[PDB]
Structures are given as C-alpha cells and as structure tokens.
Swiss-Prot record, chain B:
Residues 1-303 are cytoplasmic. Residues 1-303 form the Peptidase C30 domain. Cleaves the C-terminus of replicase polyprotein at 11 sites. Recognizes substrates containing the core sequence [ILMVF]-Q-|-[SGACN]. Cleaves and inactivates human TRMT1, preventing tRNA guanine(26)-dimethylation of tRNAs. May cleave human NLRP1 in lung epithelial cells, thereby activating the NLRP1 inflammasome pathway. May cleave human GSDMD, triggering alternative GSDME-mediated epithelial cell death upon activation of the NLRP1 inflammasome, which may enhance the release interleukins 1B, 6, 16 and 18. Also able to bind an ADP-ribose-1''-phosphate (ADRP). The active site is at 41 (for 3cl-pro activity), 145 (nucleophile). This is 3C-like proteinase nsp5. 3CL-PRO exists as monomer and homodimer. Only the homodimer shows catalytic activity. Interacts with host FBXO22; this interaction promotes the proteasomal degradation of nsp5. Inhibited by pyridone-containing alpha-ketoamides compounds 13a and 13b. In turn, alpha-ketoamide 13b (tert-butyl (1-((S)-1-(((S)-4-(benzylamino)-3,4-dioxo-1-((S)-2-oxopyrrolidin-3-yl)butan-2-yl)amino)-3-cyclopropyl-1-oxopropan-2-yl)-2-oxo-1,2-dihydropyridin-3-yl)carbamate) inhibits SARS-CoV-2 replication in human lung cells. Inhibited ex vivo by michael acceptor inhibitor N3. Inhibited ex vivo by compound 11a and 11b. It comes from Severe acute respiratory syndrome coronavirus 2 (2019-nCoV). Changing residue 90 to R: In strain: Beta/B.1.351. The gene is rep. It is found in: Host cytoplasm; Host Golgi apparatus; Host nucleus. It catalyses: TSAVLQ-|-SGFRK-NH2 and SGVTFQ-|-GKFKK the two peptides corresponding to the two self-cleavage sites of the SARS 3C-like proteinase are the two most reactive peptide substrates. The enzyme exhibits a strong preference for substrates containing Gln at P1 position and Leu at P2 position.
Length: 304, 303
C-alpha cells in the first residue's frame, strides 16, 4: 500500500527532448518523428520578449537561423511554421525513439507528469495537477521553457503541457502541444496574475474513496444530495463545481466501495460545513485535491 | 521558483528492468551486463516463504527453473548465485542498454528515486528518503518486489535499494544491491516491526529554508539558540540531533537567505513546542523531513 505523488516513467519522453536555440536564446523542444515543437518565443531576443510581434519576428527568420541539437548532435532544420504560441520545426531526421503519442488538452484537476528539462536534458520528474485557475504548482528554473507534461496510457504518450511562464506568485503557466495557453495568459515578458484558485472537488472525493477503500470511513454520513445543490454549496467554500464527466470518472471508485457519488458528495458537504472535529483522513487534517480518481485506482492497483 | 518532491529521469533504469519467474512466483529483476539481480525469495514457494533455508532451496534449483523475460524476448539463464538476499541470474546476453552504474549503500536521511515496477515494466517514479529506522515510506503493491531505488550523478546511475517487504505499519523495507537489508528486517513471511521512527532534523531545516526561498516566513522569529539547547529540545520530540556537519551542509541555504542555521533552529524549536496552529508551510500541515539540503539547493539555487 501507501499513497504518494507518483510520476509516469519518463524514459519515453526523455528520448524526445532536444535543445532549440535562436541567436543566444535557448530552451527545450519536443522531437517527435521529423518535427520539433518548442515555445515560439525562442526567436526573441531579451528585448524582443517585452512586446513581441511574433508574426513579424518570424518572417525575418529562415530555416538556417534555428539550431536544434539532440545532445551535441545537430539536426538540420528544413522547415518551420508557427502554430499559436508553439513553433514547429521540420528536421531532416525522424526521431528513432519516437513513441506512440498523441496531443491532448487536459481539463482543470487532471494530473500529468512533468519532465523538467534543461538544455535538452531532463533533470527531474514530478506529478502536477492543473489548478482550476489554469496554473500548475511546478518547480522550474531558467532554461526550463519547452519542458512538457504528459500521461502514459498503455504504450501511448499523451502530451498535454509545454512550459512557458512563471507568474509573480511562483506558480507556472504554459500551453498544450498546439500552442494554446491554458488560462488567460500570453507569452509576453510581463507580470500576469491568475484568477483566484479553488479546490478540485472531484479529486477530493477520489481522496475520500481512497480513505474508504483503506478502512477510514468515519466521515460517511447517512444523507444524500442533488448534483445541483452540492455545486451551489461547494462554491460557497471555494470548491470547484462538479461536471457530469466528474461523476462518471468517479464511477469505478463508487462501484468498488458501493458508495454512490451523490452520497459521498453529501459526506464531503458535511465536512465542509462542520470541519474535521479534530479528526484526520488517511492521516491528515488537510483534504487532498491533487489525486485524480485514476491516481487513486492506479495506486490501489498498480497498472503499467 | 517552486519546490516539489522530484525524482530523477527513469529512462536509464527502465531499460534494465526485467521479469523473473520461478514456479508460481513472479517479481522484477535488474538486468545489468550479463547478470539479472532480483530478490532471492522468488525461488521460494508458499510453504517455503514462512522460514526459508535459502541455501538449501537454491541448490535444488536449475538454470531452467528461471524464466527471465525482457519484453517480448526470454533470456536464457546460464548461471545462478546468491549474494545475501539478492539472487544473481547469469544470462547468455548482456543488456545492450546497460548504463554507467555502481552499487552504493545509502545513508539514513539521504534520498533516492524509486522506479515502481510490476512484471518487469515500470509504472511510476517517486522520491523516497531512507528513514533513520531504515524503513522507507513508499507506494508498493503485490508484484513490486525487485523494484529498485537509485540516484543519477552526471551519466552514472547509483543503485542503492531493491524492494522486498511492506511492514504491517504500511512502510516498506528492502536491501542494497549487495542483498544487505536496510534495518533489522529479514526476508521471511513474518510480521516485522521497525525501531522507533525519528525525524530527519537536517532535512526539516532545509525544507524550512526552501519555504523561505519561496516566500514563506510566518514561522521565523527574532530568537536564536545554541546547537546543544536546540538538540535538547529536538531529541525530546524524537528528532535526530543536529551535527556540525549538518550545520555546515546547510551553509549554502543560510547564505542565500541570510538566516543563520541556529536562527532556523530557533524557529524549528518554536514550531515543535507551539505546533503550526492551522497554518501550513509549502502547502503542508506537517514538518516535512524527506527533502535533503542538496534537494533544496538544486531546486532553489538562483531563485
Ligand atoms: C514482493 O512483491 C514479494 O514478492 C513484496 C510485496 C509487498 C506486499 C504488498 N506490497 C509490498 O511491498 N514482498 C512481500 O510480499 C514479502 C515477501 C518476503 C517474505 C520478504 N512479505 C511481506 O511484505 C510481508 C509479510 C508480512 C506478514 O507476514 C505474513 C505480516 C504482516 C506484514 C507482512 N508483509
Ligand atoms: C523560459 O525558460 C524562457 O524561455 C522561462 C521559464 C521561467 C524561468 C524561471 N522559471 C520559469 O518557469 N520563461 C520566461 O522567462 C517567460 C518568457 C515569456 C513567455 C516571454 N516569462 C516569465 O516567466 C516572466 C516574466 C515576468 C514578469 O515580466 C518581466 C514579471 C513577473 C513574473 C514574470 N515571469
């Protein structure tokens, strides 16, 4: 047993990380087949990033202005195009380590693994949750842009995040692999502020199902509730409202424990309104919200 | 900026994990060069695991009794030996993906990355610390035996742990790659307790420095303490004593923040006597002790 913040094995993503450089600006890129994906601001000088006109900055760039390196080995750029805030660079070599992959735009509350990369070399792996305000509580240093977030189902790597920005509050913002930012952020060198964050309700409920599975079930009450009533109450406590998809992904945990989702909602609502009464859940007085229902099942039944 | 429990990239280890089956028992193995290391209880049966005479059970085994699968290929075992609790399976093929590696014995309070594997296929990576009582608080299910813990220095993988056991308390026990258990544990099917679990003081202080580097300072105070007077209080709370080496290792963090180590100790002493009320540090409601000073320096340098 045991419950930990767990990342996916990073080997399949490691073989795809490369370094992209324009002039002196360097960051990370994702090499899949014969295309490298990286943040478009690599074409900016330090001064350009303050108020960049990317369309104009890109028209002054040719394939030969782009330095793409796998390690110290260069991959000649034979084509380039801009898709939203991501740059796509066609290279003359298909990545022999390209895994089965796809690009996905995740929802708030969903978790993914981040391969922290520097100069095209991953340095650490850790799991992140997309906060409801479209930030992630990551750990990123200078030169980390281009780091990607991913999940692995079966043998297919689903890329969902590429790093771009650190906010003044210390949290982080980025895009999907199609260059579309998560949240209302832009790739400018400007102090941008995210919206007020909230607790990921679906993940809190998954954490409660995790407790029940392990014999910690003192919090189960005899009431039930409607989805609408719970949402209205949940927002009064800074909790995100549940969707139909939330109820459905809680299905397996509901069937495994025999506790209907709306019953657990009624239990969680009582915890929100009355507190923990000096008690703990899974050895904690804090309600954990960065464990998705899939993380709970995967850690109560290790799948690979 | 930011601070997160973070493991090393697992690619180099993934290319080394294999599946080892003996009779009706399957677990993970580590394929380096022409040898596959795994827990020796894979040779045991249901009745053997209760009190196995491993030397007795091992000699009655043949190379063909061992099914070593590396993906869709089966490796031919051409030799079997035993080094303490680690069974060594010689194979006719050397692992092409063998990286630069060494076998090291981790010290208590030090951290390592764990590649949790099942049926020779890794499924998750997370960081652990070797607790003073020589257990680790991991996440392991049935079939996780053979999983390894490691660190990576440059291009060298330092293997330091192989998983064997989950104690009745939910914690986990294992060996180094020489088959020597961490702690007073034994690879038999018995319920085993560990010593009293003390807190890794130097790690808690590093983690306090990380909180300051990241904008958290509500726990600081104007007071200072001597090393001994802090250790008096710390030991009273089942905290490991702080040594001058620990003080020295914290230097970089103290310089970066401008907070003397003994000033942080005065803060920790207050936290231990008053508690945190309802407040949290770096999002946690407890004092985290599984971050080493090096972990903090690596994530907070320049921040
Ligand atoms: C390996 O997977 C075994 O091949 C591993 C799995 C454990 C159990 C689920 N999570 C893990 O980490 N180890 C064992 O099953 C181990 C086998 C050898 C004898 C060392 N035994 C235990 O972990 C074990 C035995 C007992 C026990 O007795 C019976 C009473 C309480 C707890 C306990 N754990
Ligand atoms: C990339 O590595 C640069 O390519 C970098 C990642 C950060 C470095 C430290 N931690 C990180 O996550 N990204 C940036 O530097 C971006 C670049 C934009 C998209 C052009 N900008 C910021 O992170 C940034 C700018 C400002 C700011 O202004 C100036 C004010 C406050 C915060 C802030 N962050």
């Amino acid at each position: 047993s045991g419950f930990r913040k767990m990342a996916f094995p990073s080997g399949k993503v490691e073989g795809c990380m490369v370094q992209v450089t324009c002039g002196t600006t360097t960051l990370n890129g994702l090499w899949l087949d014969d295309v490298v994906y990286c943040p478009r601001h690599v074409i900016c000088t330090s001064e350009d990033m303050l108020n960049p006109n990317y369309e104009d900055l890109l028209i002054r760039k040719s394939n030969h202005n782009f330095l793409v390196q796998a390690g110290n080995v260069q991959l000649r750029v034979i084509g380039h195009s801009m898709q939203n805030c991501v740059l796509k660079l066609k290279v003359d070599t298909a990545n022999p380590k390209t895994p089965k992959y796809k690009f996905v735009r995740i929802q708030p509350g969903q978790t993914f693994s981040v391969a922290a990369c520097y100069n095209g070399s991953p340095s650490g792996v850790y799991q992140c949750a997309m906060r409801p305000n479209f930030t992630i509580k990551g750990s990123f240093l200078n030169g980390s842009c281009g780091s990607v977030g991913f999940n692995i189902d079966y043998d297919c790597v689903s890329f969902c995040y590429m790093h771009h920005m650190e906010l003044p509050t210390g949290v982080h913002a980025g895009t999907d692999l199609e260059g579309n930012f998560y949240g209302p952020f832009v790739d400018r060198q400007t102090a941008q502020a995210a919206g007020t964050d909230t607790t990921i309700t679906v993940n809190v409920l998954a954490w409660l199902y995790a407790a029940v599975i392990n014999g910690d079930r003192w919090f189960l009450n005899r009431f039930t509730t409607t989805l609408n009533d719970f949402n209205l109450v949940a927002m009064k406590y800074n909790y995100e409202p549940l969707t139909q998809d939330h109820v459905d992904i809680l299905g397996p945990l509901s069937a495994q424990t025999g506790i209907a989702v709306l019953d657990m909602c009624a239990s969680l609502k009582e915890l929100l309104q009355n507190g923990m009464n000096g008690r703990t859940i899974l050895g904690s007085a804090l309600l954990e919200d960065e464990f998705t229902p899939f993380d709970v099942v995967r850690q109560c039944s290790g799948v690979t």
